[PDB]
């Protein structure tokens, strides 16, 4: 539910203190209770069922946006961007192989939010961000 | 009538059916359905006693979902006497209906946050717990158990913790039964 | 699109007025969603392509994105003159919150500049455009010669008046807070109700806004 | 001076910097004024028990590797300390197994280092103690730091140490 | 046949308590009277309100 | 975790230290039961710092007892635990309840419950250990342990260790 914590099971109407706390590796509606609750100790696997993701506390934060594949691209597209950010200077005013260049980041983007290539994706932005 | 009449006689009956047994229900529906009842009207339409009431008005009074009237009024053959009337304070029983089930789901997450500290001891000759915290104060010299102080008996496990994950089963599963009351 | 949109329903969710300019509004959007202002310039055009390959029978499921296609383009190219206001309550009215995001233009020299700079000779004409010297400094153009004529007339073929009070002297205004008035109402009854007796033809009446008209009516029949 | 109860006071927790009410940051010493609460780091408490050592040595006569300097100090806590030694006799060689720098030059350096970080005298002391090689590695070991040092700052500090410790 | 009515949750009646006896049969209005476990019936019973004017 | 700290203590001489030189008869009674001994208010009291001058003022005579009380204030370095806080330290002993590790002076305890699954007991080992498939917890192995849990009596202070957060366990 968008409302309702399916961990904890308690509603906002008569609990208002649960909070909007996802993680970025498996984003899971759940409570700041829950979060406080399972990964103090120590970190574990997602209490949604059917996922059995480690997750740590530490990697929880609110979510901004309420679509989750929206969320899930805006994240993945900070993880690439903090390394990849050759702007228009740095192709020393080339227009076209600048357009190539975001045509480049916005299709590992995709593969990244679709997994489709994820293993050779993340070789390469390794790679990438070695330099 | 008003259909938030028909919402509150719902949830009210559905309190009953759910936490009472069937001569609360019985009691409860027979003020919903005639609205002030006496101790004379209740008694002839279910044909209950005077006692066989009196757990019934008593919990429903302590809960708050019948209201007393104390109200004596003279009758033709004056031969008057200080009668009770029975009612529903709407507002108020939806309160302690309200604060009640809070309270219980309150107890129930702290019962479960009890629970989710480690299991600790219990020494089975004098029945005391030990937490996790008192066990290493109690340890023996060879570094290997835990000894009672009275009974100097070795410690061993209680359950808190094992039995986690069935007060959180039991939460889940009171909260789909509680699901039409919080959606009244 | 998608994550412009999820934007805009994040900036939609507050509970106070915002007035910000577009440029903040952008490097906002920037700073939390990586979306830039050349992106978005081409929004519109971007839309209406993919739309045309798309070879869709049905549109109407695609208003919105005309919407916010037309919201991106006028809010990535425009930053001068123009205001983004999101409001909580679009009436307040509604017992509910009914958030809005209005993005006006300020400036209405903008949309007229092109038209003067395009056509040289402009004759700009109206029966009742007063003061003519306010209008060269709304919109941004010279006027060569600027005058009004005033009608010869035989006899006096119009006679206007203005009446600051009821027939008991007591003062009538059309303020939207003291509508609800019995006595500005009942002057303003009694005054139409004379019109309507002494008039042969035909009577128009104007009033200062829809609700006004509703109120004062509503309680002329009452 | 109020008589009241106050028996309720949140728990010890060096993540939330509560370490109870005998352990603010501002102590008051025996001549009177308030003064920073001092914190060691483990080679700083081996070096100042050391230097007191040595100085209780010297009163009662008027009066490197870590093989050599564990039977130095051993014959130093015998020659100096006398009856219910076991738990100097611990700590000791707790802080010659677990002494991140050796000499007085380093430890003090290192004081200066951290002195610049301006943060908080438990969090630097644990810096100096605990071994950490990656920031978020210090962030999660230590709680205080969360929004308290720049990532760069804090990667600087730690790999500036790691050049620092000897041996 | 009232009791096969009883189970299905379709009336409402009072049995004696020596023996499961019906008596009097009343309609039901309410949806099903064994919605709630006997464990979070009691749990219930263990809350209380403090007084009238608080809440 | 080690802290230097201004301290007070009351000690009592008895009448027998009555001497010329009563007072390095004082300073040595502080010596030996302070010491080494464990206060839950301040910690472990490890060593008494600036032994040439200690506040040692006019001392009450007990008036039925009849020995000396002095509140001698004395500056010491002190280890006071607390929960929350990471600290290394060796393991000294072992079992099915789980091991010990001496930090400092004082001894911490890490639970069956308080280690990751893949360790596990072997008493088998000689000394026994705990086994995990990437590393072995024995006795004097070096090993990185979070204090979440600590309880100190009048004299005597026991902590609860966990390694199960990341970035903890052996050195
Ligand atoms: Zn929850
Ligand atoms: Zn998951
Ligand atoms: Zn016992």
Same mark, same amino acid.
């Given at each position: 539910?968008?409302?309702?914590?399916?961990?904890?099971?308690?509603?906002?109407?008569?609990?208002?203190?649960?909070?909007?706390?996802?993680?970025?590796?498996?984003?899971?509606?759940?409570?700041?209770?829950?979060?406080?609750?399972?990964?103090?100790?120590?970190?574990?696997?997602?209490?949604?069922?059917?996922?059995?993701?480690?997750?740590?506390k530490?990697?929880?934060?609110?979510?901004?946006?309420?679509?989750?594949?929206?969320?899930?691209?805006?994240?993945?597209?900070?993880r690439?961007?903090?390394?990849?950010?050759?702007?228009?200077?740095?192709?020393?005013?080339?227009?076209?192989?600048?357009?190539?260049?975001?045509?480049?980041?916005?299709?590992?983007?995709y593969?990244?939010?679709?997994?489709?290539?994820?293993?050779?994706?993340?070789?390469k932005?390794?790679?990438?961000?070695?330099? | 009538?008003?259909p938030?009449?028909?919402?509150?006689?719902?949830?009210?009956?559905?309190?009953?059916?759910?936490?009472?047994?069937?001569?609360?229900?019985?009691v409860?529906?027979?003020?919903?359905?005639?609205?002030?009842?006496?101790?004379?009207?209740?008694?002839?339409?279910?044909?209950?006693?005077?006692?066989?009431?009196?757990?019934?008005?008593?919990?429903?009074?302590?809960?708050?979902?019948?209201?007393?009237?104390?109200?004596?009024?003279?009758?033709?053959?004056?031969?008057?006497?200080?009668?009770?009337?029975?009612?529903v304070?709407?507002?108020?029983?939806?309160?302690?209906?309200?604060?009640?089930?809070?309270?219980?789901?309150?107890?129930?997450?702290?019962?479960?946050?009890?629970?989710?500290?480690?299991?600790?001891?219990?020494?089975?000759?004098?029945?005391?717990?030990?937490?996790?915290?008192?066990?290493?104060?109690?340890?023996?010299?060879?570094?290997?158990?835990?000894?009672?102080?009275?009974?100097?008996?070795?410690?061993?496990?209680?359950?808190?913790?094992?039995?986690?994950?069935?007060?959180?089963?039991?939460l889940?599963?009171?909260?789909?039964?509680?699901?039409?009351?919080?959606?009244? | 699109?998608?994550r412009?949109?999820?934007?805009?329903?994040?900036?939609?969710?507050?509970?106070?007025?915002?007035?910000?300019?577009?440029?903040?509004?952008?490097?906002?959007?920037?700073?939390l969603?990586?979306?830039?202002?050349?992106?978005?310039?081409?929004?519109?055009?971007?839309?209406?392509?993919?739309?045309?390959?798309?070879?869709?029978?049905?549109?109407?499921?695609?208003t919105?994105?005309?919407?916010?296609?037309? =919201?991106?383009?006028? *809010?990535? #190219?425009?930053?001068?003159?123009?205001?983004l /206001?999101?409001?909580?309550? &679009? !009436?307040? +009215?509604?017992?509910?919150?009914?958030?809005?995001?209005?993005?006006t233009?300020?400036?209405?020299?903008?949309?007229?500049?092109?038209?003067?700079?395009?056509?040289?000779?402009?004759?700009?004409?109206?029966?009742?455009?007063?003061?003519?010297?306010?209008?060269?400094?709304?919109?941004?153009?010279?006027?060569?010669?600027?005058?009004?004529?005033?009608?010869?007339?035989?006899?006096?073929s =119009?006679?206007?008046? *203005?009446? #600051?009070?009821?027939?008991?002297?007591?003062? /009538?205004?059309?303020?939207? &807070? !003291?509508? +609800?008035?019995?006595?500005?109402?009942?002057?303003?009854?009694?005054?139409?109700?004379?019109?309507?007796?002494?008039?042969?033809?035909?009577?128009?009446?104007?009033?200062?806004?829809?609700?006004?008209?509703?109120?004062?009516?509503?309680?002329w029949?009452? | 001076?109020?008589?009241?109860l106050?028996?309720?006071?949140?728990?010890?927790?060096?993540?939330?910097?509560?370490?109870?009410?005998?352990?603010?940051?501002?102590?008051?010493?025996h001549?009177?004024?308030?003064e920073?609460?001092?914190?060691?780091?483990?080679s700083?408490?081996?070096?100042?028990?050391?230097?007191?050592?040595?100085?209780?040595?010297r009163?009662?006569?008027?009066?490197?590797?870590?093989?050599?300097?564990?039977?130095?100090?051993?014959?130093?806590?015998?020659?100096?300390?006398?009856?219910?030694?076991?738990?100097?006799?611990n700590?000791?060689?707790?802080?010659?197994?677990?002494?991140?720098?050796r000499?007085?030059?380093?430890?003090?350096?290192?004081?200066?280092?951290?002195?610049?970080?301006?943060?908080?005298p438990?969090?630097?002391?644990?810096?100096?103690?605990?071994?950490?090689?990656?920031?978020?590695?210090?962030?999660?070991?230590?709680?205080?730091?969360?929004?308290?040092?720049?990532?760069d700052?804090?990667?600087?500090?730690?790999?500036?140490?790691?050049?620092?410790?000897?041996? | 046949?009232?009791?096969?009515?009883?189970?299905?949750?379709?009336?409402?009646?009072?049995?004696?308590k020596?023996?499961?006896?019906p008596?009097?049969?009343?309609?039901?209005?309410?949806?099903?009277?064994?919605?709630?476990?006997?464990?979070?019936?009691?749990?219930?019973?263990?809350?209380?309100?403090?007084?009238?004017?608080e809440? | 975790?080690?802290?230097?700290?201004?301290?007070?203590?009351?000690?009592?001489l008895?009448?027998?230290?009555?001497?010329?030189?009563?007072?390095?008869?004082?300073?040595?009674?502080?010596?030996?039961?302070?010491?080494?001994?464990?206060?839950?208010?301040?910690?472990?009291?490890?060593?008494?710092?600036?032994?040439?001058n200690?506040?040692?003022?006019?001392?009450?005579?007990?008036?039925?007892?009849?020995s000396?009380?002095?509140?001698?204030?004395?500056?010491?370095?002190?280890?006071?635990?607390?929960?929350?806080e990471?600290?290394?330290?060796?393991?000294?002993?072992?079992?099915?309840?789980?091991f010990?590790?001496?930090?400092?002076?004082?001894?911490?305890?890490?639970?069956?419950?308080?280690?990751?699954?893949?360790?596990?007991?072997?008493?088998?080992?000689?000394?026994?250990?705990?086994?995990?498939?990437?590393?072995?917890?024995?006795?004097?192995?070096?090993?990185?342990?979070?204090?979440?849990?600590?309880?100190?009596?009048?004299?005597?202070?026991?902590?609860?260790?966990?390694?199960?957060?990341?970035?903890?366990?052996?050195?």
């Amino acid at each position: 539910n968008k409302d309702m914590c399916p961990i904890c099971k308690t509603d906002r109407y008569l609990s208002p203190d649960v909070k909007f706390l996802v993680n970025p590796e498996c984003y899971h509606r759940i409570c700041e209770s829950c979060v406080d609750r399972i990964f103090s100790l120590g970190p574990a696997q997602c209490p949604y069922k059917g996922c059995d993701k480690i997750l740590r506390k530490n990697k929880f934060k609110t979510q901004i946006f309420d679509d989750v594949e929206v969320e899930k691209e805006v994240d993945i597209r900070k993880r690439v961007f903090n390394v990849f950010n050759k702007t228009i200077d740095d192709f020393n005013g080339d227009l076209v192989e600048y357009n190539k260049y975001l045509e480049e980041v916005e299709d590992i983007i995709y593969k990244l939010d679709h997994g489709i290539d994820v293993a050779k994706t993340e070789e390469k932005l390794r790679t990438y961000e070695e330099l | 009538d008003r259909p938030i009449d028909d919402i509150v006689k719902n949830l009210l009956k559905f309190v009953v059916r759910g936490f009472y047994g069937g001569s609360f229900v019985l009691v409860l529906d027979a003020i919903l359905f005639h609205s002030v009842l006496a101790e004379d009207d209740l008694k002839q339409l279910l044909s209950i006693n005077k006692t066989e009431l009196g757990p019934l008005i008593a919990r429903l009074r302590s809960d708050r979902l019948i209201s007393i009237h104390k109200q004596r009024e003279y009758p033709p053959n004056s031969k008057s006497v200080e009668r009770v009337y029975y009612y529903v304070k709407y507002p108020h029983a939806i309160d302690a209906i309200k604060w009640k089930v809070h309270q219980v789901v309150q107890r129930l997450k702290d019962d479960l946050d009890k629970n989710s500290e480690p299991n600790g001891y219990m020494c089975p000759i004098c029945l005391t717990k030990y937490t996790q915290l008192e066990a290493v104060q109690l340890l023996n010299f060879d570094r290997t158990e835990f000894l009672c102080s009275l009974c100097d008996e070795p410690l061993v496990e209680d359950d808190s913790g094992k039995k986690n994950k069935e007060k959180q089963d039991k939460l889940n599963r009171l909260m789909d039964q509680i699901q039409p009351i919080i959606d009244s | 699109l998608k994550r412009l949109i999820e934007y805009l329903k994040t900036r939609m969710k507050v509970l106070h007025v915002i007035s910000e300019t577009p440029k903040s509004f952008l490097q906002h959007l920037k700073q939390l969603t990586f979306i830039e202002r050349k992106p978005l310039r081409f929004c519109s055009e971007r839309l209406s392509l993919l739309v045309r390959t798309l070879e869709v029978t049905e549109v109407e499921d695609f208003t919105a994105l005309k919407d916010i296609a037309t =919201f991106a383009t006028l *809010i990535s #190219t425009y930053e001068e003159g123009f205001l983004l /206001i999101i409001e909580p309550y &679009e !009436i307040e +009215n509604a017992a509910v919150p009914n958030p809005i995001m209005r993005f006006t233009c300020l400036d209405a020299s903008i949309a007229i500049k092109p038209v003067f700079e395009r056509f040289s000779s402009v004759i700009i004409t109206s029966g009742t455009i007063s003061p003519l010297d306010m209008y060269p400094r709304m919109l941004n153009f010279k006027t060569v010669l600027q005058k009004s004529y005033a009608m010869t007339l035989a006899k006096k073929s =119009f006679l206007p008046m *203005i009446i #600051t009070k009821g027939s008991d002297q007591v003062a /009538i205004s059309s303020r939207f &807070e !003291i509508r +609800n008035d019995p006595s500005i109402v009942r002057n303003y009854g009694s005054m139409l109700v004379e019109f309507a007796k002494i008039t042969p033809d035909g009577m128009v009446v104007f009033f200062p806004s829809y609700l006004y008209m509703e109120s004062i009516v509503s309680m002329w029949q009452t | 001076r109020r008589r009241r109860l106050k028996k309720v006071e949140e728990e010890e927790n060096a993540a939330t910097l509560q370490l109870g009410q005998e352990f603010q940051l501002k102590q008051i010493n025996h001549q009177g004024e308030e003064e920073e609460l001092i914190a060691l780091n483990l080679s700083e408490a081996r070096l100042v028990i050391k230097e007191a050592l040595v100085e209780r040595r010297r009163a009662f006569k008027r009066s490197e590797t870590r093989e050599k300097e564990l039977e130095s100090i051993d014959v130093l806590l015998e020659q100096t300390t006398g009856g219910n030694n076991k738990d100097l006799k611990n700590t000791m060689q707790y802080l010659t197994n677990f002494s991140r720098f050796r000499d007085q030059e380093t430890v003090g350096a290192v004081i200066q280092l951290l002195k610049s970080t301006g943060l908080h005298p438990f969090e630097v002391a644990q810096l100096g103690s605990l071994a950490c090689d990656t920031a978020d590695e210090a962030k999660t070991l230590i709680p205080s730091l969360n929004n308290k040092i720049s990532d760069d700052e804090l990667e600087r500090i730690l790999k500036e140490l790691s050049n620092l410790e000897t041996l | 046949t009232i009791n096969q009515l009883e189970e299905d949750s379709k009336i409402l009646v009072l049995r004696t308590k020596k023996d499961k006896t019906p008596r009097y049969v009343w309609y039901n209005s309410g949806g099903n009277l064994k919605c709630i476990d006997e464990e979070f019936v009691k749990m219930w019973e263990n809350v209380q309100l403090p007084q009238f004017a608080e809440l | 975790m080690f802290f230097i700290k201004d301290l007070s203590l009351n000690i009592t001489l008895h009448p027998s230290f009555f001497g010329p030189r009563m007072k390095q008869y004082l300073k040595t009674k502080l010596l030996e039961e302070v010491e080494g001994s464990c206060t839950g208010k301040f910690g472990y009291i490890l060593c008494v710092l600036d032994y040439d001058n200690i506040d040692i003022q006019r001392g009450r005579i007990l008036p039925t007892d009849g020995s000396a009380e002095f509140n001698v204030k004395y500056r010491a370095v002190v280890f006071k635990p607390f929960k929350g806080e990471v600290v290394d330290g060796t393991v000294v002993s072992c079992s099915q309840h789980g091991f010990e590790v001496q930090v400092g002076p004082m001894k911490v305890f890490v639970t069956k419950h308080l280690m990751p699954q893949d360790l596990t007991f072997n008493a088998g080992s000689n000394p026994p250990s705990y086994q995990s498939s990437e590393d072995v917890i024995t006795i004097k192995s070096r090993i990185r342990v979070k204090i979440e849990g600590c309880i100190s009596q009048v004299s005597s202070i026991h902590a609860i260790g966990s390694i199960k957060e990341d970035y903890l366990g052996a050195i």
